Design an enzyme around this catalytic site. Structure first.
Site, PDB file in Angstrom:
ATOM      1  N   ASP A 297      37.155  46.976  34.357  1.00  0.00           N
ATOM      2  CA  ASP A 297      38.514  46.490  34.251  1.00  0.00           C
ATOM      3  C   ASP A 297      39.492  47.666  34.197  1.00  0.00           C
ATOM      4  O   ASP A 297      40.546  47.643  34.856  1.00  0.00           O
ATOM      5  CB  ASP A 297      38.667  45.603  33.007  1.00  0.00           C
ATOM      6  CG  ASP A 297      37.984  44.251  33.174  1.00  0.00           C
ATOM      7  OD1 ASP A 297      37.652  43.890  34.317  1.00  0.00           O
ATOM      8  OD2 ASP A 297      37.787  43.542  32.175  1.00  0.00           O
TER       9      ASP A 297
ATOM     10  N   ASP B 198      42.823  44.982  41.380  1.00  0.00           N
ATOM     11  CA  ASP B 198      41.709  44.265  41.985  1.00  0.00           C
ATOM     12  C   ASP B 198      42.056  43.884  43.431  1.00  0.00           C
ATOM     13  O   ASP B 198      41.252  44.058  44.341  1.00  0.00           O
ATOM     14  CB  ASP B 198      41.379  43.007  41.172  1.00  0.00           C
ATOM     15  CG  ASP B 198      40.078  42.361  41.626  1.00  0.00           C
ATOM     16  OD1 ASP B 198      39.015  42.819  41.189  1.00  0.00           O
ATOM     17  OD2 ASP B 198      40.115  41.429  42.440  1.00  0.00           O
TER      18      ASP B 198
ATOM     19  N   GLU C 155      40.037  49.345  37.484  1.00  0.00           N
ATOM     20  CA  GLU C 155      40.938  48.547  38.296  1.00  0.00           C
ATOM     21  C   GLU C 155      42.394  48.670  37.851  1.00  0.00           C
ATOM     22  O   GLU C 155      43.298  48.684  38.681  1.00  0.00           O
ATOM     23  CB  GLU C 155      40.468  47.077  38.332  1.00  0.00           C
ATOM     24  CG  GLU C 155      39.200  46.900  39.210  1.00  0.00           C
ATOM     25  CD  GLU C 155      38.737  45.453  39.329  1.00  0.00           C
ATOM     26  OE1 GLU C 155      38.935  44.696  38.362  1.00  0.00           O
ATOM     27  OE2 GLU C 155      38.172  45.083  40.383  1.00  0.00           O
TER      28      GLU C 155
ATOM     29  N   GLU D  15      45.239  45.289  35.992  1.00  0.00           N
ATOM     30  CA  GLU D  15      43.866  45.053  36.465  1.00  0.00           C
ATOM     31  C   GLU D  15      43.881  44.058  37.643  1.00  0.00           C
ATOM     32  O   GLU D  15      43.236  44.267  38.667  1.00  0.00           O
ATOM     33  CB  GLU D  15      43.027  44.462  35.316  1.00  0.00           C
ATOM     34  CG  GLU D  15      41.634  44.019  35.708  1.00  0.00           C
ATOM     35  CD  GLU D  15      41.095  42.932  34.791  1.00  0.00           C
ATOM     36  OE1 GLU D  15      41.355  42.995  33.574  1.00  0.00           O
ATOM     37  OE2 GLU D  15      40.409  42.018  35.283  1.00  0.00           O
TER      38      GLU D  15
HETATM   39 CA   LIG Z   1      39.019  42.222  37.085  1.00  0.00          CA
HETATM   40 CA   LIG Z   2      39.054  39.209  32.562  1.00  0.00          CA
END
Ligand SMILES: [Ca+2]
Ligand SMILES: [Ca+2]
Ligand SMILES: [Ca+2]
Ligand SMILES: [Ca+2]
Lengths: 154, 154
Positions: B119, B47, B122, B43
C-alpha cells in the site's frame, strides 16, 4: 454506417484506418473471417487508460472523500452500462453500427449488446492513447465522461 | 530511519515534506494521533497510475500476446507480494522503516507487513504522479519495476 468520419469526429481526433479497423474488430468477426487480430488488446489498454483518468479526476474533484467513497464514485462512471451508453450516443448512428461482428453475433442483437458496446468504447480509448498519448486521451475522456462524472456524486 | 533523503533518492524525484508525510501515513498512525489524513487516497491514485504504466509496457513488449495473457503477465508484476518486495529494497533501510504506524500496528510487525508495504509503495507512486505528472511517474515506475517486468514472461 460505412463512413467512419462521423465517428472520428465524435472522438475528436484522427486515427489511421488500420488502427481504427482493429479497434472496431469484435472477436466474432475476427474468427468468422479467418483469425484476424481482435480489438481485445486495445480494450485491455483502454480500460487502464480510462481507469487512471477517471481515478485522477475524482481524486481532484473530491479532496475530502475517502478511498472507499472514491472507489464507489468511480464504479458509477466506468461500469458496463455507463460505457455502453456513451457508445450508443457517441455519434448519430451510435457505435454499434460501426462494430465489425460475425454472422451469428450480428443477427442476435450483437450491435446493441451493451457488453460489446462497452468493450468497443474501451478499445477506441485504447487506440487514441496508443496513437496520441495520455494527455490527448485524457482530454477526449474528460469530454465524453464529463457528464457521467458530475452525475457520480448522486 | 528519520531522514527521508535516502528515500527521496531511491525514488529519484523530490517531494514536498507535507505530501511525502501524508504518503507515509498509515491509517493506524492516523487514528492514534487524532484522525490525521491517511495515505489511502494516494494509494488509490497510485494503484491506477501503476496499473496503466505496467499495462502500457506489457502491451508494447508483447505485441503478439492476447489480452488474457497480458492480464496474466500484469498480475505477476503488481501483486501484493511483488509490490512489498520493491518497498523492502527501495532503499537501504527499506520502506518499512519510514512508514508512520500506530503503537499497536507497530509492535505487531507492522513495519514488515507486506500488505502495508505494498500500500505504501502505491501511495508514493501516487504522490509522485500528483506532484510531477504521468511521464515522470512513468519513468520512476519503469525503473523500479524494470526487473519484475522482464521476469513476468516466465
Ligand atoms: Ca491498494
Ligand atoms: Ca485497503
Ligand atoms: Ca472480455
Ligand atoms: Ca473490458
Amino acid at each position: 454506417i460505412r463512413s467512419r468520419q462521423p465517428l472520428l469526429d465524435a472522438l475528436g481526433v484522427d486515427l489511421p484506418d488500420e488502427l481504427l479497423s482493429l479497434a472496431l474488430t469484435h472477436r466474432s468477426y475476427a474468427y468468422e473471417n479467418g483469425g484476424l487480430p481482435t480489438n481485445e488488446r486495445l480494450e485491455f489498454l483502454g480500460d487502464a487508460v480510462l481507469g487512471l483518468t477517471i481515478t485522477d479526476a475524482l481524486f481532484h474533484r473530491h479532496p475530502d472523500r475517502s478511498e472507499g467513497d472514491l472507489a464507489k464514485l468511480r464504479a458509477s462512471v466506468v461500469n458496463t452500462q455507463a460505457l455502453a451508453d456513451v457508445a450508443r450516443r457517441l455519434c448519430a448512428e451510435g457505435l454499434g453500427v460501426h462494430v465489425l461482428l460475425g454472422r451469428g453475433e450480428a443477427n442476435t442483437g450483437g450491435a446493441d449488446k451493451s457488453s460489446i458496446l462497452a468493450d468497443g468504447m474501451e478499445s477506441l480509448l485504447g487506440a487514441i492513447y496508443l496513437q496520441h498519448g495520455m494527455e490527448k486521451a485524457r482530454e477526449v475522456i474528460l469530454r465524453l465522461f464529463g457528464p457521467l462524472l458530475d452525475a457520480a456524486p448522486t
